Amino acid sequence: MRECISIHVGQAGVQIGNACWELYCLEHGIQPDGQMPSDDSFNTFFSETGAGKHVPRAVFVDLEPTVIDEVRTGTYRQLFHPEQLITGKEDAANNYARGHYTIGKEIIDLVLDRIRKLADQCTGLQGFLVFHSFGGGTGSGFTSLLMERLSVDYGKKSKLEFSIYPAPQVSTAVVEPYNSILTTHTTLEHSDCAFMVDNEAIYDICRRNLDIERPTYTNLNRLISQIVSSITASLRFDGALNVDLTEFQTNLVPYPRIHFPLATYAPVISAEKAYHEQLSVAEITNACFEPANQMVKCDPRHGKYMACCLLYRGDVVPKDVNAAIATIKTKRSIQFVDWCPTGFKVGINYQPPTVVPGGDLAKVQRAVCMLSNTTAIAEAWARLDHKFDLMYAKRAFVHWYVGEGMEEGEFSEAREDMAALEKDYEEVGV
Amino acid sequence: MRECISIHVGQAGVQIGNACWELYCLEHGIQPDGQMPSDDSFNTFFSETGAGKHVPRAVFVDLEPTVIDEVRTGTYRQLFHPEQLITGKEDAANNYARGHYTIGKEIIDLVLDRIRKLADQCTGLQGFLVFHSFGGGTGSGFTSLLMERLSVDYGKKSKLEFSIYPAPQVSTAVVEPYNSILTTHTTLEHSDCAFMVDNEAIYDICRRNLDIERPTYTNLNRLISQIVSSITASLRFDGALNVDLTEFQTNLVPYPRIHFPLATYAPVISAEKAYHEQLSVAEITNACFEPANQMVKCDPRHGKYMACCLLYRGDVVPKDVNAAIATIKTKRSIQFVDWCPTGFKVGINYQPPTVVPGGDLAKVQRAVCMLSNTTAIAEAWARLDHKFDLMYAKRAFVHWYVGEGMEEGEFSEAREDMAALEKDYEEVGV
Amino acid sequence: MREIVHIQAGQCGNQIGAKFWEVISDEHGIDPTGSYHGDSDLQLERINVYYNEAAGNKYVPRAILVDLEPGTMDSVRSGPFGQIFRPDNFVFGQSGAGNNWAKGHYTEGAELVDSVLDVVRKESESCDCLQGFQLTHSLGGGTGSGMGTLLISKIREEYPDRIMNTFSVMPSPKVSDTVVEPYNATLSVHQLVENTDETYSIDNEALYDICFRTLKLTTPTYGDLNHLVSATMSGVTTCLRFPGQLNADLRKLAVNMVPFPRLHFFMPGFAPLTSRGSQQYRALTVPELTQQMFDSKNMMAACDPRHGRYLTVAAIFRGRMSMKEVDEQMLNVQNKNSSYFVEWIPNNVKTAVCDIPPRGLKMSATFIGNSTAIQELFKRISEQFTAMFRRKAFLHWYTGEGMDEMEFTEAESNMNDLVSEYQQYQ
Amino acid sequence: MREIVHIQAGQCGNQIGAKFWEVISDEHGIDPTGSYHGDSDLQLERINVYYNEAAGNKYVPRAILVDLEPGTMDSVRSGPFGQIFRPDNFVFGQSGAGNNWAKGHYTEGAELVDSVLDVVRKESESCDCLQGFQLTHSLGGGTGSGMGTLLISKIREEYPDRIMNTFSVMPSPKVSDTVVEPYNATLSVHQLVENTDETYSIDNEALYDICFRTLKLTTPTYGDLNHLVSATMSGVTTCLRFPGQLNADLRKLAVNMVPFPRLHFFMPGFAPLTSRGSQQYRALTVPELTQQMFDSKNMMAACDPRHGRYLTVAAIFRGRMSMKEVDEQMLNVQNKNSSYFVEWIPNNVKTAVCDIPPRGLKMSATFIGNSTAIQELFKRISEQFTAMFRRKAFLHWYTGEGMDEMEFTEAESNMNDLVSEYQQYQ
């Protein structure tokens, strides 16, 4: 009952996975060899074998060996099943068409049957958690190949999707706009709730809240994983107001295509700061409505809120939460749509946020993850389709995609479909 | 009561035999000198002499000395009766006609004399277990000479037959298609249930399940024997639902000539995976219906199932088996014929699978051997009669067979009789 | 797993190659005997990229050594690492190329290529998954320019989908040793623009400028120049040999680096570079590693990038470093220098980050610049060529090998077409 | 138990034979005295295949030694292993064959064959079950070509159902020592095509090419060529002398190797072969052992198999190896080289695998190719023959022995019939 299959794709998805499974193991008290010293709280994320070893309900997929061979060699080599860690020979080269048409076309059969052997091992099944990069060749092209299959083989099941999305200024690739726009069909047609996240926004949160002047990716992935633990904590633990994975969607998603919430977490804080402020429910609730804590570089004040899920965990009480969201309704800078008079879905769970012992983030009695559908996110799309337009006006890299089996017209058909999503988020604000 | 005479013919049958008798000795606790330290469970496979020595109910036959002289010299030299290890002077040269007409014509009346001296020590002999290669000269020609005699001498007794059959691509001989097609009269007229096995399918099972990158024949024979221990387990041991060797046939064989089941075994697993793997009754049942575990390179989804014998052994309970086959009836990719609404014969036996101590195959609480009559096997015949057709259109090697006393018309009369079997398996699917 | 086949042609290609094998053997911890003696499992994890295992745990590098003279094979085989290579992969003639492209391509190397190509097959069929070919040569003289581009043509026809990746030392006016250098290079660039997926343009004038104005070496030898080249050759493959925060295969470079098919003539660089008397006074940190890496003085071709614009730059960093600091610096560079990058590409910098810095360095960056300034290297060759070609000077040595005067017309025509395509985006 | 009778004819047949007895005595662990000194029971288990047991546990080889001159008997009897043979089995004349086939077949050897054949009876009657005859000879000169094919005819008539298996060193244009080689060989091939069950075609040109290109021998003697031949002679009988995963008797080879009765002229080879300076750079494993075994440079006849197609190849492996790995490689070869195998046979490769590799190797493979390219070996001899015969040159030496000119017309007629049957299936 209440299982989730977690699929970690490309380097970004696998490295976020290596932080997610670092956290879930601590939170459930599972050793890095999969054993558990001394309730079924682990059952959402781990299959229990008769030997007394908890094996994760995960799949790790990359078209090249390097990152998963590191998972097969590091402290978690004993945890994972040796063929839920899946690797090809050939890198996708930041080319969507290698991921989707040419290279991922071979490994897909092995991936899909290893997913079947998890889904036939779940007694009921809540959904899929799919982790990837929008800018990658494996991230965009293999996830879009895999989701098209999962959306015919598992059509009823909720597909939740965690995406590292291109920034306003920070970028690692020249072709990041092409791979992201080609992905917009995947999220629109074959996903149920898609959590965009941005490297540059978390880099700024790290600088302001964690006091870390120059962070790596390990610092980022320890924030991105903490959101999925807080989304799933009601699926795993006792609470005053637990939220089911579809109860979540029935309050987040106002219209079939309007399923791109922002996400944020509070208190993101250094352990040295956390002694000198009290971090009450009202403080951490107000922190979620700061532009300073949004994990996509867009301003929520340039939008309207459609719905907010405030998923609290740890030592919080429904008195305090109602008294807090009453102050958020009083503030005229936080503007909801005219057609959502209720606005807030509240979840409250009794399990505090677990600290990764090597991490930068404080012990706190309370946290909230706020997941928030708002019109503002259309600016993160308006940034990136203006990067796409400069390059497609020249056909600037198109021969690498056409050379690997893609139709040239798919670039126009993807920029077109993105303009129809950017239309839909502007249309519902009125 | 409940005896079986096991006849091991040519190099393949003798080397499978050297695995079979390695297994039966461990499984009954008989030393390689035939003694037993400290119930009649051994009685199906071993005659007991007054010294407390258990002598196998086996005949080993080869037309050349080399392989049986190795059995007469290795660790089992003291197990067998010295005159039931039978050898000629002259190799059959991968020529059916040397095995059948010219060389085996001399050893046959000595082979029968041993089988008579074994049958006269039985009391309600259950049947014969005949092990051979379809591609060999001794394998095809001597087995077909012997079976013609046993089918007039022992007409009532069930003749079960375990055949190493030519592959799609892997082959060891140029004339393997000629010897196999000339054998099709033997299996049709003088056999009661014929278990085709393929070297290339077991090589792929070994690669994917056991992770052994480059196996020998000793690795194949330790799976082919594990199937015959699982067929015979109900004759040797206590169970919840024991299956008799004719009870087996009454559920496997729908029509007199439709007695060519596939076989598969689960779990095929090694110690590095057994600890991460689930190994419940439902999983090892579903593994029998994967194309990846069939020991002939044909796809069961290109056929229809007529009947399945699921012969479970070790720690299983009829609750779990009924609940498992209910999921197999639910899956639309596993298609039975319209005229077999029951489909499944279930056997359940309390004795776990034995580990050969030198083997790749793991200790597991449960196994199932699935033996399965399906229309799909006609493709393994359609492969090989297309190899035959290219060579017989040239008469490409026919002078070696005509030169050793065969009628040239027997090649046409054998390709004709194979086309009538390949017709019968297509005719009953409708 | 992403095997590379490496090929050395002529004196220069075998000299930058025989130094490259000393550098990557130090990285992977391989002894001059061919035995492994390294510290770390990461050195052994990807040793298959550049080496074969052989009996008794000895390692054999997957190099083919090609020359038309025995004397460079004799100099490599007797050298610091000469015993490491397979004795059968030394493929050679007896009479040299005479510094003649047409001897390389039509006579002396056309005889030998049947004996080369069938060794390139034994190494490529022994690969588990070949990613590409890594060819070291010079565009002056006749062996590297004319036989090496014959061999590129033959391997391109046989392996059309694998990466063809060439390191190409090429002529310049102020550092020259050959009269017919312009001819040989113009005949050779005509093959590189059509067949290679990447070509790394390298200049002895720029390699002497690094030695004099950055390293402050008083007497830099060819051994010191070969050390600068081979540092960037080890640099660009690093991400298939070691783990990293951002992995980039040679193909992940090509997709980001080459906007239009033919604009693949890159210009490499390396950081840190210091005098041995100033390493005590400098910080190796990513901002100082970046200010050097984008300096017109640091790049290994004569083209001042200030005479053009970058289409793409790739910065392949190595070492324990922040992704914020790397992404900050690759942003700050192309915003503060925005007049030197093309403004129809919205981000001109690719980044990659390996976890394993070179032995004895805390950090490194290898730089790859695709720059319209590379027009000035092809232009100065084509203008040196023209003044000889208009009077047919030296052409009897090439037409004596059965080459047409029409092939010079057509190679110079194709050179001006390559210049026109870089000037177009400027 | 599958005894072989071995027969040596002329200088070449007694020299490849007297080396073969040194090789199989090393395998079976037999001392030059004839006493057993080996390690293993497997060496002794099938000693009867090539030896007779005698008092004091001395073992005498089942060889018959035939010559028309005493001087090769004197050279064998005085040699490294000469004392091992039976004194009665040296059967010889005094006046030689004069390099004349008709002296061998009609005069000098027709006198001697009554004294040879009655020794072949004493050895064949001492056998428990004879499988065949293993005859070593040359097709040039007069003793091996003309007396050896007289002796094949006499043993074939007396033992019609036993395997007749011949190892036949034969002429080529660039390595020749006789004027009348084409005449002698054409008169001799006319007997081999009708009587033998297998004939292994061997060439001094190909045996020198293996010494130079791949063994890199500084100066190859006839003793070094005889060592290459005798390695393949020990190879093909291995499966009746030692245990294996797949056993193949000489008859199990013939049934698979010979599609149509007369197409039995094979082309042997051996692996590993490697220069003594290059062994350290190698992996011995089945994938690398295969890529040598099918190389046009490794086969012991001058034919490039790329000028034809194979009918059948047999690969008789020796050593501890995987059947998946052997069956994989013998598949990969004939699918990746499918233009070089006939496409009316659905699998062209026979495999066999013995558990006991040659002393001092971890693996070995002996190759047998039946190829339509062997037409080139009979075409070049028939074209040399034709030029001498069109003007009757040297024929008074043959017609002086009472031979007809009609027998030359009929032998070359039968040679062109053998060429036409191999060209037909191409």
Ligand SMILES: CC(=O)O[C@H]1C(=O)[C@@]2(C)[C@H]([C@H](OC(=O)c3ccccc3)[C@]3(O)C[C@H](OC(=O)[C@H](O)[C@@H](NC(=O)c4ccccc4)c4ccccc4)C(C)=C1C3(C)C)[C@]1(OC(C)=O)CO[C@@H]1C[C@@H]2O
């Ligand atoms: C204590 C200290 O800091 O030593 C340095 C050093 O002083 C300096 C000057 C080194 C030194 O470089 C030179 O002397 C040099 C001379 C001519 C041409 C090129 C280099 C050094 O020799 C070079 C050497 O580099 C390496 O060992 C790298 O692993 C390099 N491989 C080799 O140089 C090498 C040499 C012999 C045999 C095999 C390999 C490498 C570079 C890229 C990719 C892979 C490997 C290093 C760090 C140093 C010394 C030793 C002084 C420098 O080189 C490098 C690549 O770091 C030159 O400027 C840098 C900055 C360093 O500070």
Ligand SMILES: CC(=O)O[C@H]1C(=O)[C@@]2(C)[C@H]([C@H](OC(=O)c3ccccc3)[C@]3(O)C[C@H](OC(=O)[C@H](O)[C@@H](NC(=O)c4ccccc4)c4ccccc4)C(C)=C1C3(C)C)[C@]1(OC(C)=O)CO[C@@H]1C[C@@H]2O
């Ligand atoms: C230390 C080491 O590895 O020694 C090897 C060796 O270096 C190499 C080069 C050997 C060597 O071969 C030659 O020198 C050679 C020269 C001319 C013609 C043929 C061979 C070797 O001499 C040959 C010798 O082979 C044998 O001993 C076989 O059992 C062989 N029998 C004989 O050669 C033999 C010699 C004298 C007396 C009696 C027998 C054999 C071959 C086929 C079937 C049965 C037996 C071997 C392994 C080696 C040396 C000693 C260097 C090679 O030969 C063989 C058959 O393995 C040549 O290429 C291979 C690869 C080997 O590695």
Ligand SMILES: Nc1nc2c(ncn2[C@@H]2O[C@H](COP(=O)(O)OP(=O)(O)OP(=O)(O)O)[C@@H](O)[C@H]2O)c(=O)[nH]1
């Ligand atoms: N937060 C974070 N972002 C990462 C991480 N790894 C990669 N990224 C982001 O991933 C984006 C690019 O996607 P790639 O890493 O190239 O995705 P990929 O699927 O491996 O692409 P291919 O190599 O082509 O298969 C960049 O914008 C990075 O910032 C990580 O561990 N954490």
Ligand SMILES: Nc1nc2c(ncn2[C@@H]2O[C@H](COP(=O)(O)OP(=O)(O)OP(=O)(O)O)[C@@H](O)[C@H]2O)c(=O)[nH]1
């Ligand atoms: N699994 C397995 N297959 C074997 C074994 N030995 C032989 N085979 C198969 O046997 C087939 C050929 O038959 P042979 O081994 O030549 O049979 P044979 O009866 O000894 O033939 P003859 O020598 O002519 O008498 C090949 O396709 C082999 O793959 C073995 O021990 N195990």
Ligand SMILES: Nc1nc2c(ncn2[C@@H]2O[C@H](COP(=O)(O)OP(=O)(O)O)[C@@H](O)[C@H]2O)c(=O)[nH]1
């Ligand atoms: N970097 C470097 N340049 C070299 C070396 N040897 C020669 N060169 C230079 O580059 C050119 C190379 O041409 P060369 O290799 O001699 O022609 P080839 O032998 O016919 O291919 C020469 O004119 C030299 O200026 C060397 O070891 N290193």
Ligand SMILES: Nc1nc2c(ncn2[C@@H]2O[C@H](COP(=O)(O)OP(=O)(O)O)[C@@H](O)[C@H]2O)c(=O)[nH]1
């Ligand atoms: N391999 C090998 N070839 C030989 C040997 N002796 C001679 N030959 C060559 O093969 C031919 C053999 O002919 P030969 O045996 O002399 O004729 P015969 O004595 O009349 O049978 C000669 O012309 C030589 O070229 C030898 O010891 N080994």
Ligand SMILES: [Mg+2]
């Ligand atoms: Mg990737």
Ligand SMILES: [Mg+2]
């Ligand atoms: Mg046999």
